[PDB]
Amino acid sequence: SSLPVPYKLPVSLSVGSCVIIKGTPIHSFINGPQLQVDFYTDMDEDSDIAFHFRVRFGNHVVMNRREFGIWMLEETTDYVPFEDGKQFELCIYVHYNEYEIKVNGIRIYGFVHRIPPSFVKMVQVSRDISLTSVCVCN
Template identity: 40%
Template sequence: MAFVAPPGYQPVYNPRIPYLGPIYGGLREGMSIYFQGSIPEDITRYFINLLCGESESSDVALHVNPRFDGWDKVVFNSRQNGSWESEEKIRDMPFSKGQAFEMIILVNSQGYQIKVNGQDFHTFSHRIPVERVCALQISGDVSIQTINVIGVRRPVTAGAHLPPVPYSSMIPGGVSPKRTIIIRGMVPYGADRLSVNFLVSRSRDIAFHLNPRLGEGVVVRNSMTGGRWVAPITMHPCTMIVFVSQMSIRCGNQKFKVFVNGQHLLNFFHRHQPFTEVDMLEIEGDVQISYIHF
């Protein structure tokens, strides 16, 4: 039976701008919104709004507005009852014309912490309770490739988790042919490496070690038996360099198959026999996990 993820975990790819869409389940402290996009050469300005309703006239809890107008700046604000409040102008421009960017809005107890290309940029203090936010609006001179809400409000299907890293869990029922494990999350800008291990719990043998080394630009695949690593296999990681929204690891009779964002990335032929002894999953390194489905 095919697995369909709940709507709150679905990333948005290549949305048409202007964009207006819901944030399923709303926001809360500890969540974050990830944007991957690019700025055109002829940009004037664009904005991102966190809305308290699903219409353009709704209250705005956060307004992020980069302006390229000769006095380049980013303006932050909020709007209540149809009236804009006091602006916070940051006369610094972290975005570059003609360049790609990554932006993360992290929700904390103080406000919205904005990071651009891995660097802290500004924190906008809460003026409206974050629990009222239920929609996202984007308009202006910008191209967006990915929007992903990390750490959704609550799991809505069996098998869903919001786990810390490092992560370790038994795989209910163990690994079997045609079984697929789905991992969703975010690899932040500037991350170095992460690892996903499929283990035999009783021996601690690692049947499949998947190790994207982002700083080196390779993915290492390996196994460990009796405390010793076997000769690794490496390859270029393609779509895993900066951001992973979904990784699926499917077990077959001969090999593990790894897919990233629906695209086949690599295979790893079984070295541990029988592979059906694999019954544990471990995840470590530079990754923020939003969802795991066994």
């Protein structure tokens, strides 16, 4: 891996920002690897989370937020077009209303803001992946 995992990147996001994460799962899908991305409101890992994204590869994706320390209503989707053993490209685009989530160019979900994305001060990429690059674009 080019970057350490868990990878905690201080960020400032606004509408129009784009988070691009490139990496590879470190296990085959029959071994149940996961990939987690958290849009944290501070560097402390107990802080509130504006957007939590957790892929169980070849299985499903769980999404949520954490407000006042409490997990809210979980959202999910079965569309997880990652490929076993291959590098992936995960793009999270900050729209005025939602985060649009693309997996290898394929839009899979829009997670609607319950707090403004400018509250996000850190992005953490974690679990069973090797990280090639993380880029924040405007």
